[PDB]
Amino acid sequence: PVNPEKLLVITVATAETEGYLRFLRSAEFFNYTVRTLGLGEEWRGGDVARTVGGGQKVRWLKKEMEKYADREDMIIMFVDSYDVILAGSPTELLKKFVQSGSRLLFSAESFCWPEWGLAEQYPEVGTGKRFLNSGGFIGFATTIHQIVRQWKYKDDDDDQLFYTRLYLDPGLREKLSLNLDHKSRIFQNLNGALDEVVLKFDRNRVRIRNVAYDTLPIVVHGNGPTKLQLNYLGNYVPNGWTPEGGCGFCNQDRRTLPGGQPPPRVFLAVFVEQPTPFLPRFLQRLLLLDYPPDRVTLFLHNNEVFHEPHIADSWPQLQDHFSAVKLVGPEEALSPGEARDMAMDLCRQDPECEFYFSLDADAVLTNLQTLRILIEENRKVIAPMLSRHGKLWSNFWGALSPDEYYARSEDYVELVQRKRVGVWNVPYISQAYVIRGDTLRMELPQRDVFSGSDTDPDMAFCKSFRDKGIFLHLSNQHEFGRLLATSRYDTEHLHPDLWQIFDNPVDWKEQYIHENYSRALEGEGIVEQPCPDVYWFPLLSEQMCDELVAEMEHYGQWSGGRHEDSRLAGGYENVPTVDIHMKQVGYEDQWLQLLRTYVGPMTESLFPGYHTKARAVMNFVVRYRPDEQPSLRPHHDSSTFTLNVALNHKGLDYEGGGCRFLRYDCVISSPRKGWALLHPGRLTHYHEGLPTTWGTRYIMVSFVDP
Amino acid sequence: AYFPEERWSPESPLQAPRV
Amino acid sequence: LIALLARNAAHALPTTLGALERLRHPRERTALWVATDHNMDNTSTVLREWLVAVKSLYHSVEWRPAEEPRSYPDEEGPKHWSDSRYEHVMKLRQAALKSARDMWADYILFVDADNLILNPDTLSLLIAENKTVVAPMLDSRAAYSNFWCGMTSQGYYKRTPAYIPIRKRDRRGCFAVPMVHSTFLIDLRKAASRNLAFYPPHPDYTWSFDDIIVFAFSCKQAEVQMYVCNKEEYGFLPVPLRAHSTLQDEAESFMHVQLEVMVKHPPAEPSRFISAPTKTPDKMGFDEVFMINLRRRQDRRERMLRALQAQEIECRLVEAVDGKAMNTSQVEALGIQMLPGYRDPYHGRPLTKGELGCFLSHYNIWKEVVDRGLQKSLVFEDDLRFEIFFKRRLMNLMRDVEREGLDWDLIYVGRKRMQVEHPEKAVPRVRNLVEADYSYWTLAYVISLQGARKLLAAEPLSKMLPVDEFLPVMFDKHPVSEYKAHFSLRNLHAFSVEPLLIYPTHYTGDDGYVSDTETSVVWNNEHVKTDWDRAKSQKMREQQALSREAKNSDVLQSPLDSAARDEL
Ligand SMILES: O=c1ccn([C@@H]2O[C@H](COP(=O)(O)OP(=O)(O)O[C@H]3O[C@H](CO)[C@H](O)[C@H](O)[C@H]3O)[C@@H](O)[C@H]2O)c(=O)[nH]1
Ligand SMILES: *[C@@H]1O[C@H](CO)[C@@H](O[C@@H]2O[C@H](CO)[C@@H](O)[C@H](O)[C@H]2NC(C)=O)[C@H](O)[C@H]1NC(C)=O
Ligand SMILES: O=c1ccn([C@@H]2O[C@H](COP(=O)(O)OP(=O)(O)O)[C@@H](O)[C@H]2O)c(=O)[nH]1
Ligand SMILES: O=c1ccn([C@@H]2O[C@H](COP(=O)(O)OP(=O)(O)O)[C@@H](O)[C@H]2O)c(=O)[nH]1
Ligand SMILES: *[C@@H]1O[C@H](CO)[C@@H](O)[C@H](O)[C@H]1NC(C)=O
Ligand SMILES: *[C@@H]1O[C@H](CO)[C@@H](O)[C@H](O)[C@H]1NC(C)=O
Ligand SMILES: O=C(O)CCC(=O)C(=O)O
Ligand SMILES: [Fe+2]
Ligand SMILES: [Mn+2]
Ligand SMILES: [Mn+2]
Ligand SMILES: [Mn+2]
Known part of the structure; x- marks a missing residue:
């Protein structure tokens, strides 16, 4: 039951990077009393971990320890600040240290970084880590003073070899009761033990666990080339993200x-x-x-x-x-x-x-x-x-x-x-x-x-x-x-964005599909029934209509007009019109995709109990001009129902008419630009298009479900 | 891939008795 | 509710059904869901008989036979796990789970054909844990068990450093794991257990199409954790074989599981309602089979008789020459004289009496095989642990060596290799045989007529020493040259088997170790009783001591000695 007010964590941080602030937040979360050393001076060492360095920290600690050389009722912990996060509580740390018993515990790693020849001098250890690492240690004030008072070297001298040489002496080790944390009970090093640490979530905090020895460490040190793993661990441990508390x-x-x-x-x-x-x-x-x-x-x-x-x-x-x-x-x-x-x-x-x-x-x-x-x-x-x-x-x-x-x-x-x-x-x-x-x-x-x-x-x-x-x-x-x-991205087109219905469906929908289509689909009006069993809803915006008309006119070869046919397997048209089938311009597959995606669900909601696959064979665009060909004679269609979409404005560019139904004396006067007409076209709708006198008009037709 | 986990799955509440 | 799925499981059904019938749980609070199909043997008949006999006691029994067809179309063999087989297993397990829910029964215990639930209190101890999914840890002959410790990227095994401490029972308690299969137990009263589904994969499922990984994903997405814990021993299960073996291999695997049960427990008794198809032993194609046992020792011979019967092998038994009891009057009647300048190589004691009796029995066996002129014979001991496919591997090896032809005398089958060094030469144009070296432990050896005649002509009456130190002398492999100088001819050509076939049941300094020899009185006098060596045992095992660059990889291996699946 050692008093938690006798702990003093002292770290070294010349500047205030983000790692030091993260360590500070982690420490203040569990009520510790940190004291940072050398906050403002210049780093008189060298490369941080390239070849050697770290000889200034021992000098600073020796200079500081003169004010605690007589205190025995305090326990001193020394930890690196830039790559360490705490995951335990001060009482737990004190209990584990007292259970260890020794007057100085270091952190044990598995590699001999500075010098390799001293490998065989270390006392043997069966399972746990064997060597010594100077990235963290805890002990009484008098023992720490005795250890640190012997530092006399150049400021650029290495640090770990000094501690190793001091520890390898048998008599000195027995005299000052040195020890190592063999089984990663307090200090855990993330170099050579990356496959033994698992995150262990809890109600309102997160803790790490060592599966190899079933111990929960207190401090985590990402030494060596494993700083990215520590950055990954810092998002959770200890109060970063919690299962019921969102973010920290x-x-x-x-x-x-x-x-x-x-x-x-x-x-x-x-x-x-x-x-x-x-x-x-x-x-x-x-x-x-x-x-x-x-x-x-x-x-x-x-x-x-x-x-x-x-x-x-x-x-x-x-x-x-x-x-x-x-x-x-x-x-x-x-x-x-x-x-x-x-x-x-x-x-x-x-x-x-x-x-x-x-x-x-x-x-x-x-x-x-x-x-x-x-x-x-x-x-x-x-x-x-x-x-x-x-x-x-x-x-x-x-x-x-x-x-x-x-x-x-x-x-x-x-x-x-x-x-x-x-x-x-x-x-x-x-x-x-x-x-x-x-x-x-x-x-x-x-x-x-x-x-x-x-x-x-x-x-x-x-x-x-x-x-x-x-x-x-x-x-x-x-x-x-x-x-x-x-x-x-095919750039060999007049308007390449039209073919983007397969790569970016969402942006294609926002740019080309009519802005009122969703409201009409959800059923808040818009869709009209001017005559029995014929519907009138918006499908395409102005951009798609203009772009399609310009692209078709770029083709130029406005075939059609002869009673016989070459594009049809039968080889004979019942009624000829000047048309450009989509197979010729390559837009057939995209048009079938549009029919499958957008027309389908609406024609299912409009006519309950009807299931569609939107499979179509004949779909084209016709041009009505008073010079080349007039309107059509009364006829039927070879399809379940037909879709009739206009592609320009009435009056501004042409002066004509729409469709006339013989069996109902129904006449459509002013079709809109992007609106589509839906009507069964096999049995009960004997329709016939009206003639046009001024200008030219465009219509897109598709005999879906033949 | 790193840091395998042990998520918080608290025992689920019992179901209402059959009648 | 207890759910069984049987297919080509006629060999295993009696023992496991008898084991499951004795569960300490009231018989009026249990229901059955046996469902068999796609089988070659008569598993359906025996399952039907057991059901008809036991239908009265249990609450409600189900039965779903689908005798035809007898094989999947697009499968190479009975062990080929085609996608259709996976689909059928998914559908069957999902149907069992669904019929366990619409019946208002909490808990459901998924047992399969080969798992031997030995502890009668397994069900109660699993019920008393209060978890949704929990599975006992079942033992096996290898590192294989019925739980994983990690998924790599797409649902594949990965060895976490916390496996061996758990499997070898260095830790105890119930530990969360990402996989339990074979035998487990699902709570049907907790609310979270309403989203578990076997067959229909989750919409977010993108991994491969194995049948046990789909349930792990379902458990993970439903926010439940699967436990597995091994506070005590529960049962055993055999290791899966390759995807091209036959049914005979599976039968031998289960028989070896049966043998491995007996080595530390009373035998797994079969059920009562159904019987066992008693087998007719064969002589391995040998001439004789001798097994030297003491009359005073009665527990040892019973387990060995059961082991020999279960392996379909006869036994021309021979007694022994009681020696703890033989005195000098009959010791010196046959000219038995202790070898000039001999001692214990590890201690320094002259000689004991158990070795005298053992050497006398071996000498008598040799004399008998010489007199009756058997071409070959097999000799045994009282503490054996046969390896998998022992009979068939021994037949194949002996057929190979006899067909090729050479001067074989003393093919070893169980021994100890203390001479750990660079490997030994391998005989050309033969498989699984290596040249002999220094070795103790003459547990078993195949004697020949020529070798026995040479050994008798050596006349070892006036030279007394333990047989394990005797045999290495006569083929010029003993270290010290003084004993060799004491002998004249070394015309023996011993051999051995690199994948050793027989191991002792009990090692030195272990539980239940009683040695007839070693701990006894000296060959002379009557007041020097050496105790069993605790610290100076020196005969622990040559397995951990061989965990180095022993190699011996240049040998040619038989098509057997290959098994296991994702786990090792
Ligand atoms: O048509 C059927 C009906 C039942 N069974 C039963 O399925 C179980 C599978 O056990 P095996 O001994 O054939 O095989 P494995 O050891 O390979 O089984 C392990 O791996 C398999 C493949 O992963 C399955 O997941 C199985 O659940 C798991 O215990 C046995 O009860 C068998 O009778 C079938 O295989 N096919
Ligand atoms: C098994 O675990 C469940 C947890 O779901 C326990 O249910 C708890 O029962 C107590 C009894 O009053 C309630 O206060 C808790 O709220 C319940 N837990 C939850 C999460 O709601 C159940 O008691 C456990 N079984 C035994 C025998 O203790
Ligand atoms: O620019 C600077 C100034 C100071 N330090 C200090 O040097 C110590 C050692 O750095 P690191 O912990 O990054 O070393 P490794 O453990 O990788 O050798 C850190 O704790 C800081 O206190 C540093 O690394 N870089
Ligand atoms: O009086 C006798 C007669 C025989 N044996 C032999 O000892 C063997 C069993 O001894 P054990 O194998 O336990 O000794 P270990 O070699 O294991 O130390 C049996 O085969 C017997 O043949 C013996 O020790 N004393
Ligand atoms: C420790 O933490 C609690 C929780 O905020 C705090 O109220 C208490 O005062 C703290 N103790 C110290 C020594 O600050
Ligand atoms: C969409 O409908 C709204 C109805 O409020 C109308 O104001 C708007 O002009 C329509 N968009 C068109 C016609 O592009
Ligand atoms: O021009 C129209 O609106 C009618 C044309 C039509 O449907 C057809 O030509 O089949
Ligand atoms: Fe038409
Ligand atoms: Mn560091
Ligand atoms: Mn199995
Ligand atoms: Mn023995």
């Missing part, structure tokens, strides 16, 4: 953008280096972001000769909108890495650079408040979570393979499907991030971050950002949008 430090430290002064300036950066679908929609959405236009500068980098007309058309709106706008064209022969480096150099060299919001053109930002939230989070680097539609692709990696490429992690699927919500720590983010300005200025003053290597620019950026010790956060609290699939 994932909603605080929020600016909330007060002051009345205009919000912090942001240097927008948009990069286009591939032929991407739906680019003009992205450009027109750029103006709709919720941020004042007198603060957001812009840097648009276009790297394709194919995308010049779109940006050239949309340029005046951007030039008027934002405060300052700069374009880099394709004629500069600029590699993508050089362009990204130039953008970061531009903002970094500008003292007004307060943030930096890079944004790839292959990123649809459904949420219009993403920028405000990401500025408000106040982290060094934070990225939203965008995921492909109906897949597990995303813009982050759960874990890293030894080849430094993608390697699947354990909870990637949980994060992708938003079963867990918070601000996670990941080794790789891409396609959208918000880097702070001062981080670019006084923490990464180097210029070449993307280029200068054979590797891809994104992996190079993430590697150079991880090597400096900066965390890459990733927030998936809200819905931030989706990614577009640009793997394949």
